[PDB]
């Protein structure tokens, strides 16, 4: 029903996520990793790229500084404290992963509501069609992309039924067919499997 999805990160191997909505993969506009994720240190960019939003930096000079300050601000928090967090916190790593189907860049964030041990340690965020993502995106200014017609993503995530849009060669497909097509492409390209 769902899918495991591998996002390529330059020079650092793969970031694995699990999603129940592989059909929304063209709508993934960012990734969120657990702050303790083993790849975070390698992903940290030398400088903030020009597309960095000042709400993503913690006010720090560099990705490394933002990451180590964030890690310290959350080190004491319990694991339910983190996962049910009503406040959205996080920082940008500077890094971009490759969308395994569309090939587009996906900025990589860390945030304490993602935890090691309770899942893959990374999620793919589709704010257009996942309310939790919509709220996190809303506080930081992350992009919000509609890929399922039928709602209004400027106001809230659309979790209902509709056909695919803004999804290249998936355009017009039913959600159930798009789920399979994305899974089969991942399998064929060695970038995931059904789960």
Author numbering: 304 to 498
Article passage:
Leucyl-tRNA synthetases (LeuRSs) are examples of aaRSs that rely on their editing domains to limit misaminoacylation of tRNA with near-cognate amino acids and maintain the fidelity of the genetic code. Here, we identified epetraborole (EPT) from the MMV pandemic response box as an inhibitor against the essential protein leucyl-tRNA synthetase (LeuRS) in M. abscessus. Benzoxaboroles were shown to inhibit LeuRS in fungi, gram-negative pathogens and most recently M. tuberculosis. To gain insight into the interactions between EPT and LeuRS, we solved the crystal structure of the M. abscessus editing domain (LeuRS303-498).
Comparing unliganded and liganded residues in M. abscessus editing domain structures shows a sizable shift of residues 416–422, located around the adenosine pocket, upon drug binding, including ordering of Y421 to interact with the EPT-AMP adduct phosphate, and a decrease of B factors in the neighbouring residues. This increase in order could explain the relatively lower entropic contribution to binding observed in ITC, although an unliganded M. tuberculosis structure is not available for comparison.
